[PDB]
Structure formats: structure tokens, C-alpha cells
Subunit: 210 residues, 6 copies
């Protein structure tokens, strides 16, 4: 038997928090939707589909891990004959979706009485993320303006990565880049540069500032 | 069998030492009181609930474990077959928490004579914390005074993460923060600040620093 | 026995990207052409034939891995004891181009109705690369001007190293090299060269630059 | 002979030597005195109760290890089935005070013929210690001094930990500390301080030194 | 055919490339000619006799290794229960020189039809080396021409050690050593030296340069 | 022959070079003389007794290792059903004295026909040592001098350990120390010292020379 489930549109939504808010806590419903209990697999999905903050993947992942520890700790994995293939008291693996893999899992989860794993596990998540908001704390390019006595060259270079590393829109990307570049030379260099007025390729201007 | 047990209010208490004093001594006699001998699990709890001085648990835990070693060293269970004596006794691992199952703790504890698992373990702990106290010393954001030649630019960072690492009223936190920022400027940076008089976004100030 | 295919000429084709403009993201539809869905051995081939940009490969390989993981994840590897072999539910490794003998893989691809690994795997490939190109962002010996406080010797070191790393005719290589060495001096270093006017082996000039 | 044995007072004494002369060689006749025979378990004790010179423990420990090596080297268990009457021949671990219960130690020692565990081990011990004395050589908080271009913050830090790291009254510790801070300042720094004349929170002075 | 075989005179020859041009790309076809197609011990021999460029040993060695891989890849072990061994299907290892005692390896070459490993292995090798010439790219003590703003003091030290690292006649070594040391010397350092005129032990001169 | 042989005098001798002038390669015909080809245990002994250039032991050990490889390489094992225990295709381990401990070893060595391991092995030694001599090239404390810009404190430190790390007489140790510190000192520092004229412990002067 198979119920119909989780669209990729809904994924698109999940995605969409990322797409809105890739690495920024304007999260709340998005989680709430995604925390429609879920199983591992979906949850696994979200975390699979997750990017942005590897560190966040981390943060949860310890949290989870100790949640697992806690699971075993609050339920020290009590053995038996496992008469009619039970629930196999959830671990980190289960939290991976492994141990009564998803059908079977859901099978526990909507085993009635349940063993509704992804939700428990969900509590594990549930445990991190907020704190993740509490944890993660951006980020910004603008300040990539050249250091105190930082040299230019690097400054643009750095900048160059950083712009590489920055957001969407080529158009923006070009013009902004000059436009933000300007001040991202540090004032003194920028002043030289301003004193250059224009230039084109970096390099000549730069060449002055090396 | 059940017995009713430890609250999370009691946790709130454990907490109460902790939010009282997450990174320093003078919270202790009362916590030590509140460490009513313990079991592994409560100790585990404490350890679960543990944080603040990452070193503190860290040094303690080895010590605890070497306390286990010492246990082993003064007896590791130099023995074999059994009719589960002294609530089927433990080794260092149980004393680590480890190979105690829930029962085994309780069992050990209220078996008569017991095995005072959490108490030994407690003693191990008991062994550390004091030292922790005995030497463990915080630390502050205030210190992000711009010591010898620190440049404000870093500083802004220095604060900014540190501030990130700083807490409570954010509102408060700013105003003092600027006001303490000025302070934590090195006089010369401070000068730039004085010389800035007012600013707002960092950057213009930063620009003075860049 | 074969349904005869591929060649090193077709490799010359794979190659054809690479030497043509290996960093030519612009090559991908051609590649997509040369990935005629791709079998594991050809996919293996491509990765075998792979070279020059391991960073890119690196990124990719992660995807492949993630793909593998994903495969098992998104196809829970819900195998058990076989009955007439059936290409044994490909794992990440098979998908790595590993498990199943190459024919047998292939066999699976041309199994009717296949176990056609190589496409999936192809998507894996696709899964890195495209993006990988899409931000895999070079590189250049020209960029090796000369730092702010970078002196020539080091510049030679760089330049020359990079030059070591640079391609083409030696003849080219020299002349540009003076001329671009010229250019890629830092302006002051550039000055020393300008101030040097001519010279021959580096060293004497260089000697000025030490 | 479920005997009578070494006290913690006597331990206290050994320990006391450490407390006497924590990092100072001139222990030795006592050392030999508490070395008197020494069971491996007591020898374990000495190393157990050991602390404050991990380098020493370390350095010794290679000797021990070599001593084990040597043990096997000068006698590599050239044996097969232990017949009755042998108090099981030691190896490096036993000689480490490891493999054995006390009995096996004593059994080896006062099994007559013995196995003179504690003595061998004693040579081992001796083997570190000698060197240890012979080279080991502190340390000094005075050296928290602000060296050549050393600057203050660090100097105080240096003070702060180090003074923290030092022994005795806090009271003492302060007054000397100012009195020792002052001058261990590099002169130019000392001077700033002299030029500060007095001060109180470090920071204003320090701020001057930033 | 348990013949007479390869001399060390032939080694002297292998050597002859090597002392001729030990860590430089241009001695080689003439050596490859002198490879005379080598089999494993001999290939090993070359590897045995190999030295100077561990990185080269490396460079090849990846090639070998991937050659092995390729090998494994292109020999996706079709091996099963061998019917009378018949110079047993190589694996990377054989090709590493690893598999088979040498005769049998040799047999594997010189059997007729052979299963000549050593040629393949030779191919592997053959596969690196060229590229090694393509890879490796010298080398020179002269290049201990003094840095830009760095002291002599090291510069000579560095030299001196480099000189350690340098080879040939000592006699030579001195005079050049002053004579190029004088030179290596940054002009400014060199000048100090010139200004030193003579000296004898380094040190007094050095002493001027410290 | 449950023989009578070797000496700590023989050691004393072994020592005598080492201790005479361990970094005088000028020891070598004697040392090899003192080798008399030997066994593992004595050679091991020599190697046990070894100390001074860690690196030396290392490099030899590297040699040994490769010698072991060579042993197998030039004669792998080809082991099957040993008849009368034999000399069992010795390796690095045998060279350790591992495989065939000394009695049995010697038993092979004076097994007639022999298998005189320590000699082979001796050739392994023989294989290193030379290099060791030929490259191993000290060392010298004098060269601790107050840098080019390395400062005194460190200089004296550097000195201080190092002198500690240096040889001989206490008397000497005092006098040199004044005399050899003063001036090893970069001139400019030496100047401060000259400018100190005298002082007493370092420190006052150093505290001045910071």
C-alpha cells in the first residue's frame, strides 16, 4: 500500500526557504510546514536538500547525535526476542532513516500504536534549528572593503572572490561591482583610485596600488 | 517498580546554577548540595545539561575516566562467573555512565548493600569540579580593548563576533557597546572615534580605520 | 562479443574539450553529446580520462558520492537474496563504475528492460559538473603581477612557477615573459625594471630587487 | 599475608615532595627512600599521584617504554605453557604495573623465588627520573615580562594566566604583581607605566599601551 | 632459461643516467633504451636504484597506481578458480612487483605465450616518466641568491646549509662559495660584504650583518 | 656454546666513541671494528645504546627498512613446510632480532652452514651509517647569537637552553656564558651590552634591552 505524499512542489517550498532565505531565519512557517511531523525520509530530504550552512548541518548533527545519545540514554536500547518485528527503539541510524527504512518506518510510524520516528527525530531537529538561528549570524560582503592597513591587491582579489561568492543577477553584478568596489578599496587606496577616477580592467589601477 | 523522581524544576535548579554561573565557581556549594550523591543518569543529566566550560567537562571527564582507571587499578573486576552480585556489579564504564542501564543504576543504588555508582562517579566528578573552580577563569568582551596595536577594523570584527558571542539585551548591548567600543578602542583608535565624534553604520568609522 | 563502440578518437573528442578549452563550460552540450547517456565504463572512462581540474573533479566526486548516498537513500537499497542475478540493484559503487563487471554493467544497461546505471550515474556527473563549471572560476598567470609588498624574487618565483605552469611554445614563452614580467611587476618593482631598463639573466636585475 | 601497607600519609610525603619541590630535583635521597622496593601498584601510585610535570611523565614514560622494550629485549618471554609454581613472568605491561593484580605483583616479589617487579620497574623509573632531574629545569613567572617588542596586553595576560598559574596568596600575588608587572614591562613599556605613575583597572594604563 | 643476468655495471649504466642527470628531465630516452623493456625485478631495480626525486618516484607512482586502477579497470577481474595457474591474471600488485616471486613473474613474462607483467608494468612506468620529464623542473643553490628584505645572517645560513645540501669538491666549494656567496648576498648585504672586504669565519662579517 | 661474551666495556667502548665525539664520524673504523659484523642483539644493542642524532637513527632505520624490503626484494620469503626450524627467510624483523631471537639467531649464525643475520643486517647498518656520516653534519650553539633582528631575551633564552643543551664543566659554563653570550649577540645588541658595560644576572640588562 502506498499513500500519495510530499511533492517536489512542497520540496520547492522547502527549497524555497532556502531560496528566500538560504542562510537567514525567516524560516518559521517553512519549518512549520516541513515539520508536519515527517518521517525520516522527508526529513532526510530536507536535510538532504539542505545547503547554505554546513555548520548548521553540523549544528543539528551534533544535536541530533546527542539526541541519539539521549535517545539511548533515555531509552537504553532494551533487547528482546523482537516478537513480531517491532519498532526497534530508534537510534541515530533510525534518525538517518535506517532501521525500519521508510516504508517500514512509516510502518512503525503509523503503526498504530505508533513508533513515529521522524517526528521524534523531528524533535531532534527541532532541537537544533532555532538555536541555529541563535547560532548562525551571517555574513556580508560589504566590509570586504580593504582592511586597515590591508593592501589593495588582495583587496580586490578578495573582493573578487567574494563577488564571485556573492548573490544573483549579472546585471547587478557588473555594475554593482564597480559601485561597491569603489569604496571597497580602503579609503586611502580608494582615494588613489578615485584619484585615478576611472580605469577599466582592474589591473592597471591595481597596478598602481600594488 | 517505580519511584517518583527528579524534576526538571530540579533541572531548573541545575540550570539555576548554570545560568547563574555557566563559566565560574561561586555557584557550587549549593550545586554540590544539589548533587544529592547521584546516579549515573542524573549525573548524565548534568553532563547532558552541561556546557559553558568546554574544558571543564573536558578535563574532568578524563579525570573521571582515569578515576575509573583508578577504580580499575584498585579493582577492575578482577573476577569471572557470578550469580549477579551487588546488583551485578560494575566497572569503570558503568562509572563512566556507560554500562549502567537504568535499572543498573537504581539497582546498584538501592540494592542493599548498594553499589553507589553515581556516588563514585560523583566522586570522580567531585574530584574535578573543584579544580575547575580551582583554576577556571573567565573572561570578557570588555577585553576587546584594543591592546597594543590592535586595529579597529579587526576590532569591529572583534567585537562583532565577540558581541555575537555576547548576549542579554541587545538593546542594551548596543548602547553600551558603542560606548564600550569607544573605550575598547586603543586611544589612538579611540581618537579616530573621537575624531569621528558620531558615526552610525560602522563603515564610515571603519573607513577611518581603512 | 560486442555491439561495437567508442574509441580513443572519441576520446580525442573528450579530450577535445579539454585541450580546447578545458575551462570551457561552453562545451557541455558537446559533452552532453559525448555523453550518449553514458555507461559506467564510459562514464568511468571519462572520469578516467579526466585531468587538469581535480578541484572541479573534487566537487563532482562529492556529488557522485552524494548521488551514491542518494541512490541508496532515495532508493533504500531494498534488496534481499537474489533470484536470477538481475544486475544486483546498483549501489553507489556500481554507480561509481565499480560493482558489476563492466560488461555486466553494460549488460545491465542494455538489459531489456535494463538496469541502466550509467544514466543515473550520468546524472550524477551532471550533478556536479555543470555547476562546477558554472562557478569553477580559473586562474591566470597574468594575475601574477606583483603584490603590494611583493618583491621580484618572489615574483620570479611566482611568475616563473606559474610560467612553469604556463602552456605553449617556448618561443612565445620567452618573449611575453619578459614583457609580461615587465608588466606583472608591482609598479615599484616595475619601476626597478624600468629603472633597470635592460638586463638579461634575471639575477642582476633581481639583485637590484633584493 | 593480607598485610599492612603504605599510607596516604606516606604517599602524602611523596606527594609532599612534589609539594615541596614540585619541579626541583633535590628530592633524591627521599626519592630513593620512598622508592624503597616499591610495588608496581605503588609505583603506579607514584605515577598516579604524579602531576605538574607531564613533560616529566612523558619523558620518563619513554624510558619506561624502552624499559619494557628492554625487558622483552633482554628477555622476550621465552616460554610457552605456564606450569604451576611460576608467578607468571612479567612483561612490560606488568612492569608498567599493568598486567597483574597486586597479588601478582607481591606474588612476584615475595614469591620466593621472586620476580622483582617493583625493582625492575624501579630501574625503569629511575631510568626516567634521573634524566628528569638531570635536565629538567623549569620555568618562571618573572619571565612574564614584556620582552623586547612585547606589549602590554599580553603582558598582562601573561600576567594573568601566569600569575594565575602561579602558587601562594592572592594577596601576595597582587602586590608583588604590580611590583613585578611594572618592571617586567619592557623599559619603554615600564616607562609608560612609570609615566602612568599609578592606575588601577588595567585598561586605562593598558589603553595607553594600546 | 635460468640464464646469467643484469649487472651492476648495467646499474652503473642506470646510474650513469642518474649521476649524469639525477633530478633533471633529459638523460632519459637513452635510459629508456637502456630500460630494454624491463620486467619486475628490474623494473623494481630501477625503482630500487631509484632515489633523488621521491616526488618523481611519486609521480610515477600515481601513474602506476592509476595504471593499476586502469589495469583493474580494464581487467575487471575475470579471474575465478584458476586452472593450473597459467601466469596468473595480473592485478595492480603484480604490476607493482608485488605479486609473484620473481621467477614466476619472470615466467609470466618469459613464458610463451607469456603473460608478461613486467612489460605492462614497464608500460606503467613508461607511462609516468616522460611526464616526469614533463614534470620535474629543477633546482639550484645559486638561487640562494639572497632575498629581498631579509638578513644575510640566515642568508648565509641558509646558504650554508644549502651548501651542505650542496655537493662536489669542497675545495671548489669554498672558493665559489665566497664568490657566489658574495653575490648571493643582497646588494645591500653584498655591499656590507663589500664593505667588509675580507673576513674569514663567517661570523664576524655576519656579525656586521646582524 | 652457552658462551661467555661481550661487555659493557665493549659498550664503554661503543660509548667511547659516542661519548668521545659522537658527531666525529672519525669513529667509524673503530665502530665497525667494534661491530665485528655481530648479531641482532648486540647490533640491536648498539642501536639501543644509540643516541645523539635521532635523525641518524632514523635514517638508518629508514635504510634498514628499505633493506628489509630489499631483503625480501632480493630474496622474498618462499616459505612452506620447514624442516629443522632453519633460518626462515629473514627480514627486517629478524633484523630487529625479532624473528629468531638471539640464541636461535646465533644458532643460525654459527649454524654451520650459517645464517648470520646480524651480519646481513650489519650490511643494513652499513647501508645507513655512511650516509650518516657523510651528511650528518651537526650543529653549533655559538650560532645562537642575538639575531639579525632576533632579540635578546630569546637570545639569552636560546642560549640558555642551548647552553643547557650544551656539554661540559660548570666552570666553563659560567664563564663562557658571559663571554660568549655578549658578543654572539648581534652587534647592535652587543652594543647594548657594551653599553651595559657590566650587569649581573642577565635580566636587568635584558629588561633594559627589551
Amino acid at each position: 500500500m502506498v499513500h500519495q505524499a510530499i511533492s517536489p512542489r512542497t520540496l520547492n517550498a522547502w527549497v524555497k526557504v532556502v531560496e528566500e532565505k538560504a542562510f537567514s531565519p525567516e524560516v518559521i512557517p517553512m519549518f512549520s510546514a516541513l515539520s508536519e511531523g515527517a518521517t525520516p525520509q522527508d526529513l532526510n530530504t530536507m536535510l538532504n536538500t539542505v545547503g547554505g550552512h554546513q555548520a548548521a548541518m553540523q549544528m543539528l548533527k551534533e544535536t541530533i547525535n546527542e539526541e541519539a545519545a539521549e535517545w539511548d540514554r533515555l531509552h537504553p536500547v532494551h533487547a528482546g526476542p523482537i516478537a513480531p518485528g517491532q519498532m526497534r527503539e530508534p537510534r541515530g541510524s533510525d534518525i538517518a532513516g535506517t532501521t525500519s527504512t521508510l516504508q517500514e518506518q512509516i510502518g512503525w510510524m503509523t503503526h498504530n500504536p505508533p513508533i513515529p520516528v521522524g517526528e521524534i527525530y523531528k524533535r531532534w531537529i527541532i532541537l537544533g534549528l532555532n538555536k541555529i538561528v541563535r547560532m548562525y549570524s551571517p555574513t556580508s560582503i560589504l566590509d570586504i572593503r580593504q582592511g586597515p592597513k590591508e593592501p589593495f591587491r588582495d583587496y580586490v582579489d578578495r573582493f573578487a572572490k567574494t563577488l564571485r561568492a556573492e548573490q544573483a543577477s549579472q546585471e547587478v553584478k557588473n555594475w554593482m561591482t564597480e559601485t561597491l568596489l569603489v569604496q571597497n578599496a580602503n579609503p586611502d587606496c580608494k582615494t588613489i583610485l578615485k584619484a585615478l577616477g576611472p580605469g577599466a580592467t582592474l589591473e592597471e589601477m591595481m597596478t598602481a596600488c600594488q
